[PDB]
Design a binder for this molecule. Structure first.
Ligand SMILES: [Zn+2]
Lengths: 183, 519
């Protein structure tokens, strides 16, 4: 079996909006959590994701990904998966380390555009999962971490599903696996 | 003890036609040699490569004597299905490889050939079917076979070390000094392989417990070993002792203690998410170990290697199958030990263990509750090290929580610190279990009051004996009279909480939620 999961509390309850909680704060704290998880999980296989194995960042032959630059004005960039994903990790961490967007203090409110910023983060976090599953699940099995990977993805996709933060068309590279876990 | 003799007789008496019976007795002998302490003459015997020798007979079946417990089993499986004429009902994706290994070893441990020959061939057939048709199993077998082929000269050289030039390994409990250097434990790289490999010398005289563990799912948390063999060494005595020499990859991120220290310099919002990622692995390892009726009495951060962001164990010599051992029957570290173990020792000036007291003759530890305490102390050490450069002297004091060393604690730090106090209570029967801990890790993002309620549902406070004082604490907070008018009504409950022999953290912490309203 390779669809195994780890023991844990009920993940559907774990992603529910607690009573009296601000939705932005709930999105913020879980986004910081999920980024660290996928950043840790990608670090396990980083020596297997190379320029030779992944010349084009993708989730399989049909889902080629391009990088939309946030500072330079240029058509989205077609690049390797190691270049794309470490582009992405430093970019996300810069967002979370910005008190303007993810305020940790009490007296600082969330920006008017916080939702759009978080859903762009959550969209790109999904693409690291999809690249790992499609192109590196053999390395996942050789390190015996299927259950931890699946459990992290299960937690992540339940939170996205709970609040509808990624479009279904973007979840397409893993539609079969998504409906397998949520049943 | 040199007990393999009647199995050698049965092997020789077995017809040349019946090669399943031959292989059965070779795997039975091999299972017994792993349990047996060597003397000088049994070392020559297991190293006999001449005709009539144990090595030579294994080469006839392409079984490598120096292979890991897993690869040697699959090599036995490949040899056995060459001789199979009765093909079983094959279904690959409906088969647990760990269950087949456990059932095979129970046969080798204590069953005769006449009572298991068919299932024994059947089990090995299924093992070999995964080696051919299961991508995961096939790749594991392929990697280990290839490394074993490349390190073959190094194994010969190590085995050929002069009888007067063997290393002498002094023993010591401290890990603050480093790893002792001998001729065998120098890192090295090989042909085209990127990760450096290293040999290690475990401090034991046989591998009985190691053999049993590698057939359980908990072995996923072991550093993958590629070669196992016993070797001659010299002690301070000057007598020849025998220790296992094991090959594996060098773990590239040291241990969990050093991982916690590195976070001190990084982004603070990353501390609690990463503690979750690491302790989800520790918790799963603990429960999976407990499922095998095995226990770990020396749980602490620097005892868990980190490699490619994976938490792993390599020092398994301390594992026991005894769920209720006497303090003298387990090996642990005093700084992280529960109080029921520290009460079986005698101490000197400044507080160093020097021996056992009369409690050690009868007082037994409950290992699951023992491990729960140490896992809690591991979490307290991880939390504190992201803030301090060294552990504070009040580290063992339970009235000093991990969060009290945080200047700007977030809700997740508050919640994790609460779990530390739940796992490290004095009474072992009142400690939160590792299973309950696993259930609560996923709710660490809840607001602290909401997370507190989650703990109450998981582990009701009536099971601590404090149910009376709890309802007497909410009698006054549920009332809407606040100010100094409440404190007079909230005074008689503040009295009963000041007589408690050790402070119960649930009461202490909810009495704070009462004094906030009176003031
Ligand atoms: Zn890749």
């Amino acid at each position: 079996n390779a669809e195994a999961t780890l023991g844990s509390g009920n993940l559907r309850q774990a992603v529910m909006l607690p009573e009296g909680e601000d939705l932005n704060e709930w999105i913020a704290v879980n986004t910081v959590d999920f980024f660290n998880q996928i950043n840790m999980l990608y670090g396990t296989i980083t020596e297997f994701c190379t320029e030779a194995s992944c010349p084009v960042m993708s989730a399989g032959p049909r889902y080629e990904y391009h990088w939309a630059d946030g500072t330079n004005i240029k058509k989205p960039i077609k690049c390797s998966a190691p270049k794309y994903i470490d582009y992405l990790m430093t970019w996300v961490q810069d967002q979370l380390d910005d008190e303007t967007l993810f305020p940790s203090k009490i007296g600082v409110p969330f920006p008017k555009n916080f939702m759009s910023v978080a859903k762009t983060i959550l969209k790109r976090l999904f693409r690291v999962y999809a690249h790992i599953y499609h192109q590196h699940f053999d390395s996942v099995m050789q390190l015996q971490e299927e259950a931890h990977l699946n459990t992290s993805f299960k937690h992540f996709i339940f939170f996205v599903q709970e609040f509808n933060l990624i479009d279904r068309r973007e979840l397409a590279p893993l539609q079969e696996l998504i409906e397998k876990l949520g049943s | 003890a040199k007990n393999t003799m009647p199995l050698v007789i049965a092997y020789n008496n077995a017809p040349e036609d019946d090669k399943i019976q031959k292989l059965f007795y070779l795997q039975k002998i091999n299972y017994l040699l792993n349990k047996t302490q060597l003397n000088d003459d049994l070392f020559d015997w297991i190293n006999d490569a001449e005709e009539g020798g144990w090595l030579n007979e294994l080469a006839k079946f392409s079984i490598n004597p120096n292979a890991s417990f897993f690869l040697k089993g699959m090599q036995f499986a490949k040899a056995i299905t060459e001789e199979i004429k009765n093909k079983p009902e094959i279904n690959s994706s409906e088969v647990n490889i760990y269950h087949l290994m456990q059932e095979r070893d129970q046969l080798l441990k204590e069953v005769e050939f006449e009572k298991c020959a068919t299932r024994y061939a059947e089990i090995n057939f299924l093992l070999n079917e995964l080696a051919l048709n299961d991508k995961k199993t096939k790749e594991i077998v392929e990697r280990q076979t290839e490394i074993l082929r490349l390190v073959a000269p190094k194994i010969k050289a190590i085995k050929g070390e002069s009888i007067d030039n063997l290393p002498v390994i002094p023993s010591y409990k401290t890990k603050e000094l480093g790893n002792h250097v001998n001729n065998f434990n120098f890192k090295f790289t090989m042909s085209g392989w990127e990760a450096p490999f290293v040999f290690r010398v475990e401090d034991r005289h046989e591998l009985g417990k190691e053999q049993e563990l590698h057939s359980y799912g908990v072995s996923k948390y072991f550093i993958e070993d590629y070669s196992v063999f016993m070797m001659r060494f010299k002690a301070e005595d000057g007598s020849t002792v025998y220790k296992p020499v094991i090959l594996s990859q060098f773990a590239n991120q040291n241990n969990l203690e050093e991982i916690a220290k590195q976070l001190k310099d990084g982004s603070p919002k990353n501390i609690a998410p990463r503690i979750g990622y690491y302790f989800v692995q520790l918790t799963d390892f603990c429960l999976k170990l407990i499922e095998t009726h095995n226990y770990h009495p020396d749980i602490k951060l620097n005892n868990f290697l980190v490699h490619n962001n994976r938490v792993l164990v390599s020092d398994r010599k301390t594992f026991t199958t005894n769920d209720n051992p006497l303090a003298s029957e387990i090996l642990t570290s005093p700084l992280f030990a529960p109080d029921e173990f520290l009460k079986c020792l005698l101490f000197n000036k400044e507080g160093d263990p020097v021996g056992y007291n009369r409690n050690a003759l009868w007082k037994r530890m409950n290992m699951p509750q023992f491990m729960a305490y140490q896992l809690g102390m591991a979490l307290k050490q991880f939390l504190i090290l992201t803030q301090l450069d060294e552990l504070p002297d009040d580290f063992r004091n339970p009235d000093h929580s991990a969060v009290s060393h945080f200047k700007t604690p977030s809700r997740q730090i508050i919640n994790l610190s609460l779990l530390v106090q739940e796992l490290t209570r004095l009474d072992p029967d009142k400690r939160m279990t590792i299973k309950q801990f696993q259930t609560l890790l996923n709710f660490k993002n809840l607001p602290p009051d909401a997370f507190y309620q989650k703990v109450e549902e998981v582990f009701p406070s009536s099971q601590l004996g404090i149910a009376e004082d709890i309802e007497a604490l909410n009698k006054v907070l549920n009332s809407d009279l606040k100010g100094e008018a409440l404190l007079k009504q909230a005074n008689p409950v503040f009295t009963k909480l000041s007589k408690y022999d050790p402070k119960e953290t649930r009461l202490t912490r909810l009495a704070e939620k009462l004094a906030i309203r009176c003031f």
